[PDB]
Amino acid sequence: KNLREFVFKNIFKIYSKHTPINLERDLPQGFSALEPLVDLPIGINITRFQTLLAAYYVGYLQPRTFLLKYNENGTITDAVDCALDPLSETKCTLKSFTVEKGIYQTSNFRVQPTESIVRFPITNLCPFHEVFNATTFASVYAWNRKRISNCVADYSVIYNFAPFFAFKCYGVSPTKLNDLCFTNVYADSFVIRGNEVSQIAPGQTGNIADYNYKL
């Protein structure tokens, strides 16, 4: 009879819910809804819980979908959990607590994957110590076109080098590079001044963009 729901959502504000109820046994049946009490605007991370004794009924919560009934007072008098049993699922699909006789298409049965398999073929590493650390990247008008194929593409060597002013990946997510497989790799190495880097991007037009090297 001292219900206390505590949640901490980064949508960063805490929420507390409470309701006092008459009680004669232990956690009884009933849909006494907890009215939110405080919404303290704290923003630091929380991962523990403790109760100060001067009984203790900890229950963890999970993402679920519910169907709630409101009476003619703005009070929740009944609820249905849409993942408990098929009857509750069909109640949620019909949006009615009373379900008439019949057959109702509710959800879809799927067989989840048991194991993950990768079969990438074998050993030879791709030349990246040549395209980088070459001591001469030639010019923007005469830029080196290096073809990379038939090898293990290890992009960790790129991260191993100096911090990058602009490491921008357009078609591919930078973090997911090592997972993907590619048909052919082209390395285009040159040296340009700092202020013209922003103009070297797909879909962007400019003097340096069109007269030196246009992606």
Partner 1 sequence: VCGPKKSTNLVKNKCVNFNFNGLTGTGVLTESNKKFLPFQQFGRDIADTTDAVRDPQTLEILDITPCSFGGVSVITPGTNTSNQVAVLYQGVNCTEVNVFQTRAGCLIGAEYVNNSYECDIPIGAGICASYQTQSIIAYTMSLGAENSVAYSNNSIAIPTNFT
Partner 2 sequence: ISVTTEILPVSMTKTSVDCTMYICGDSTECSNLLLQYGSFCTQLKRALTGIAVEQDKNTQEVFAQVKQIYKTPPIKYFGGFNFSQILPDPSKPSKRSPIEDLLFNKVAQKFNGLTVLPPLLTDEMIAQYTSALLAGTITSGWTFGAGPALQIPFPMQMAYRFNGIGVTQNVLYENQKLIANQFNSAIGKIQDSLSSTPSALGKLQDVVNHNAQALNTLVKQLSSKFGAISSVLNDILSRLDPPEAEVQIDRLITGRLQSLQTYVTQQLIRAAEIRASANLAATKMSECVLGQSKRVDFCGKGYHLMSFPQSAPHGVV
Partner 3 sequence: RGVYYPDKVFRSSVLHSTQDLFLPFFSNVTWFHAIHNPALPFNDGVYFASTEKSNIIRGWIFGTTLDSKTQSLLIVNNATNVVIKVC
- Binding positions for partner 3, rule: CB under 8 A: 1-9, 14, 17, 23, 26-27, 30-36, 38, 40, 42, 44-74, 76, 79, 81-84, 92, 95-97
* Contact partner at residue 207 from partner 2, partner 3, a copy of itself, none, CB < 5 to 8 Å by partner kind: a copy of itself
Distance between CA atoms of 1 and 88, rounded to whole angstroms? 27
Residues in the chain: 215
Interface with partner 1, residue 114, by CB under 8 A = yes
Cα dist. 209→50, 170, 178, 213 in Å?
61, 17, 29, 6
Q: For residue 69, which of 80, 57, 78 has the smallest C-alpha distance?
A: 78
Residue count, binding to ligand NAG (CB under 6 A): 2
Pick between residue 21 and residue 125 the one whose CB is nearest to partner 3. Answer: 21
Residues 131 and 189: beta-carbon distance below 8 Å: yes
Residues 30 and 60: beta-carbon distance below 8 Å: no
Stretch that binds partner 1, among 1-9, 47-55, 70-78, 200-208 (CB under 8 A): 70-78
Which residues, 6+ apart, have CB-to-CB distance to 206 below 8 Å? 199
Interface with partner 1, residue 179, by CB under 8 A = yes
Residue count, binding to a copy of itself (CB under 8 A): 8
Pick between residue 14 and residue 94 the one whose CB is nearest to partner 2. Answer: 94
Interface with a copy of itself, residue 121, by CB under 8 A = no
* Contact partner at residue 26 from ligand NAG, partner 2, partner 1, none, CB < 5 to 8 Å by partner kind: none
Interface with partner 1, residue 75, by CB under 8 A = yes
Distance between CA atoms of 123 and 142, rounded to whole angstroms? 33
Record the tokens describing residue 164, joined without a space. Answer: 């990058």
CB neighbourhood size of 163 (10 A): 6
Residues that bind ligand NAG (CB under 6 A): 45, 47
Residues that bind partner 1 (CB under 8 A): 35-36, 73-75, 85-87, 89-90, 97-121, 126, 148-156, 177-185
